[PDB]
């Protein structure tokens, strides 16, 4: 009765989107083909799985996921693997070639063929389900497939559905390292056409997760089985107060009123406190008033920026596990007496918590140990404003003399959007400067 | 108590009825050696409709199987079901008809009806109370359209009270398999309207669609398009053969559907069609069946129903069911698409309910319907005819076997005035 719908577009989202459904199937009892073990029965009262699963007539539980990419290489990677039995075989829509970093492809030439069919699945599930609460898209700003094609899927729901908030998650195009050359050209393109049709758009930087693995963990040289398993924890705890009952539970419709002050400041961060292996948490103690302070460490953020140069605007400390709600107000006023953690003056309170009665869990084979508690803090800060100063600076130096523009103009694109979008990310920076500028 | 006399002709018919007579063997638990080995007891209740009794508990059908050549009923005996069909019920000729009408209607199929009518009139008076008839036959060939239309003609001359039904294999309008289709199919539908009450038109172009896009088989035979035709045959009589919530017989849908003596050309269907590989992802419930059979891509003749207005629409159901939920679904398909019915009848939909679903299903339904967009099944044949009558394209075959051109000229004045009744109401 509290369902949400998920789509996964592009390789950087469908392969995290692989790792989303390891974790979800293990929170409940579903064996990975979709059948219950049936040695253990469950009583008929609970309706927990309906956020993400829809059980069929007989005994099989079926997810809410539309794994679409215009390539076969990553969908048939799943369609022949060990998770093939879970999904609907008509959900697995594929195509002919990648967008290949061409917004002139993923939105104009090749992306417009399957777009009349991929909306027919988002129309199908939401026809059957009634109490729909939001969308969980999984994309990336970088390439022309995960950012060119998701903007087509972003504006067709706004004309059709409307009032439902649309909670996508993404990989930020980094400051330091990258694996393309047309990414500064490309990330400005999704901003112009989605900003009038989006109500939430999160972000993660991927090379901070490289360096969390070196300090909090002891992982040197991390693969992408490891980073996508830290993304899975955060999404499963944002989406845990809809499928589990707790003390302080929030529907997805308060996540837009209380977290979006102005109609152009809706891009907040995320972090997760106890990423500790077994050789250290056997030595540490982990109480409540000392996992909350670790959430404000610069060594624990999932995005490399400077929280010490960012005045915190609206934290929302989601907890899990064996926690008791005196300890948070012991912890919160301990945080707000600290001198370094600067907040926003004209916001009077700027705090929110959520306490639930379900613990954190670990998919087996990973590094993580059994932690009794878990904090998943969504930090709406000022600190990410100067990370827009670099990517616009990364855009215009090839746009001094128009490099790689002649590949876009082949597939039905004009130059004119590139100039019209650069002031649009210059109109976005002037509002993040004024909010930290106090009203005297 | 209400048996069914079955007729067959041609080689087009006798591949279909060979597939019709095995789902009856499936649902009544009949093994291919003549006995019965089904685990129920309701399957043995009204066994008499299709299974006459003999010694040893043997159950052998009321079957008639006819052709003008021996080359086809050799294979029917050589199928998987050889011991069940009666050896005295293989009436045979020697010379094939060869895509011509008077080879079966006036000369070689005409001398042989006196041995078929011996078989029927002996057999049909062994029934304690027959309900009526049924035929699956070729309009495309020379034996079904040639000889079998005499058996529709002469048996109706004997008993005018019973009901004539036809699982007509009408030709496709796009891709044709014989150059004399606008004669054997044109002349056969000259005698269908004075003689036959239920007419189910079936196209293979309409059925090459369904076993690809819906059942998802890349290599379809006839024997896997024959079974969907053999699905809808036993999918008609679901309520006479078994108990349930609302039983209906083959006079009960020949009254609810055909308001006129000449507007009786039906349009068949079948409800629950989904792939073989993805069978266990759907939920086989009441909204799944109705959402398929009210569409154009679940239709067994090759005419789009959207170009006209249905006069009357029948149905039937099977399986344990909640009758209010169908009643919500039948008004919605009369309230939403009200432009796809005529406004001069109050009620257009009939339903009827069995109790036991088929072996392997839970919810079953079958779609039978009158529609005035069956004109495009007949205007294409009626415009093929006059494009070759005016060039006299094959008339030397027909004149040299005992016909005229006045038996040709009046066979489109029927076919024009048939469409000149359907046109006004749509």
């Amino acid at each position: 009765m509290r369902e949400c719908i998920s789509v996964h577009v592009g390789q950087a989202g469908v392969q995290i989107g692989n790792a989303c459904w390891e974790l979800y199937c293990l929170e409940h009892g579903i064996q990975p083909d979709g059948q219950m073990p049936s040695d253990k029965t469950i009583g008929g009262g609970d309706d927990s799985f309906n956020t993400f699963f829809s059980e069929t007539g007989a005994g099989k539980h079926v997810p809410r996921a539309v794994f679409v990419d215009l390539e076969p290489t990553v969908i048939d990677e799943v369609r022949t693997g060990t998770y093939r039995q879970l999904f609907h075989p008509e959900q697995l829509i594929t195509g002919k070639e990648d967008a290949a970093n061409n917004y002139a492809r993923g939105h104009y030439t090749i992306g417009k063929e399957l777009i009349d069919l991929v909306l027919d699945r988002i129309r199908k599930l939401a026809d059957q389900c009634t109490g729909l609460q939001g969308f969980l898209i999984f994309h990336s700003f970088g390439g022309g497939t995960g950012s060119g094609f998701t903007s087509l899927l972003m504006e067709r729901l706004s004309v059709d559905y409307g009032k439902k908030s649309k909670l996508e998650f993404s990989i930020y195009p980094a400051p330091q390292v990258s694996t393309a050359v047309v990414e500064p050209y490309n990330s400005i393109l999704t901003t112009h056409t989605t900003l009038e049709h989006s109500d939430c758009a999160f972000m993660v930087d991927n090379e901070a997760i490289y360096d969390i693995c070196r300090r909090n963990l002891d992982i040197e040289r991390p693969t992408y089985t490891n980073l996508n398993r830290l993304i899975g924890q955060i999404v499963s705890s944002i989406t845990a107060s809809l499928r589990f009952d707790g003390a302080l539970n929030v529907d997805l419709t308060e996540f837009q009123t209380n977290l979006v002050p102005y109609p152009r400041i809706h891009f907040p961060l995320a972090t997760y406190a106890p990423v500790i292996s077994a050789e250290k948490a056997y030595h540490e103690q982990l109480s409540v008033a000392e996992i909350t302070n670790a959430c404000f460490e610069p060594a624990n953020q999932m995005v490399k920026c400077d929280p010490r140069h960012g005045k915190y605007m609206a934290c929302c400390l989601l907890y899990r596990g064996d926690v008791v709600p005196k300890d948070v107000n012991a912890a919160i006023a301990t945080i707000k007496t600290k001198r370094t953690i600067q907040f926003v003056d004209w916001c009077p309170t700027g705090f929110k918590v959520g306490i639930n009665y379900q613990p954190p869990t670990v998919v087996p084979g990973g590094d993580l140990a059994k932690v009794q508690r878990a904090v998943c803090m969504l930090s709406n800060t000022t600190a990410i404003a100067e990370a827009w100063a670099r990517l616009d600076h990364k855009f215009d130096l090839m746009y001094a003399k128009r490099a790689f523009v002649h590949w876009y103009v082949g597939e039905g694109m004009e130059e004119g959007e590139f100039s019209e979008a650069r002031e649009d990310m210059a109109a976005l920076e002037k509002d993040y400067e004024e909010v930290g500028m106090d009203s005297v | 108590m209400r048996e069914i006399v079955h007729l067959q002709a041609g080689q087009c018919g006798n591949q279909i009825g060979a597939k019709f007579w095995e789902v009856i063997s499936d649902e009544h638990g009949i093994d291919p050696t003549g006995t019965y080995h089904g685990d129920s007891d309701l399957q043995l209740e009204r066994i008499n409709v299709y299974y006459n009794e003999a010694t040893g508990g043997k159950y052998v059908p009321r079957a008639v199987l006819v052709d003008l050549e021996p080359g086809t009923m050799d294979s029917v005996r050589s199928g998987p079901f050889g011991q069940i069909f009666r050896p005295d019920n293989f009436v045979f000729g020697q010379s094939g008809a060869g895509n011509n009408w008077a080879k079966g209607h006036y000369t070689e199929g005409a001398e042989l009806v006196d041995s078929v009518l011996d078989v029927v009139r002996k057999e049909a008076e062994s029934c304690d109370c027959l309900q009526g008839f049924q035929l699956t036959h070729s309009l495309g060939g020379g034996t079904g359209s040639g000889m079998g239309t005499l058996l529709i003609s002469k048996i109706r001359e004997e008993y005018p009270d019973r009901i004539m039904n036809t699982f007509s294999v009408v030709p496709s309008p796009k891709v044709s398999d014989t150059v004399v289709e606008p004669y054997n199919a044109t002349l056969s539908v000259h005698q269908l309207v004075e003689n036959t009450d239920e007419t189910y038109c079936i196209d293979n172009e309409a059925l090459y669609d369904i076993c690809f896009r819906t059942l998802k088989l890349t290599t379809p035979t006839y024997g896997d398009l024959n079974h969907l035709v053999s699905a809808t045959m036993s999918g008609v009589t679901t309520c006479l053969r078994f108990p349930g919530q609302l039983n209906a017989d083959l006079r009960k849908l020949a009254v609810n559907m055909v308001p006129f003596p000449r507007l009786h050309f039906f349009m068949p269907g079948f409800a629950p069609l989904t792939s073989r590989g993805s069978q266990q992802y759907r939920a086989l419930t009441v909204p799944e069946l109705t959402q398929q059979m009210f569409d154009a891509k679940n239709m067994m003749a090759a005419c789009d129903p959207r170009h006209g207005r249905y006069l009357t629409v029948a149905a039937v159901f099977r399986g344990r069911m909640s009758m209010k939920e169908v009643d919500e679904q039948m008004l919605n398909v009369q309230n939403k698409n009200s432009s796809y019915f005529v406004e001069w009848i109050p009620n257009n939909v009939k339903t009827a309910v069995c109790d036991i679903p088929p072996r392997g299903l839970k919810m079953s339904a079958t779609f039978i319907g009158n529609s005035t967009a069956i004109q495009e099944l007949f205007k294409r044949i009626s415009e093929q005819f006059t494009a070759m009558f005016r060039r006299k394209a094959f008339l030397h075959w027909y004149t040299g076997e005992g016909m005229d051109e006045m038996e040709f000229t009046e066979a489109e004045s029927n076919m024009n005035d048939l469409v000149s009744e359907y046109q006004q109401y749509q």
Partner: peptide
Amino acid sequence: LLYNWE
């Protein structure tokens, strides 16, 4: 995984 793979 050609045409009609699954």
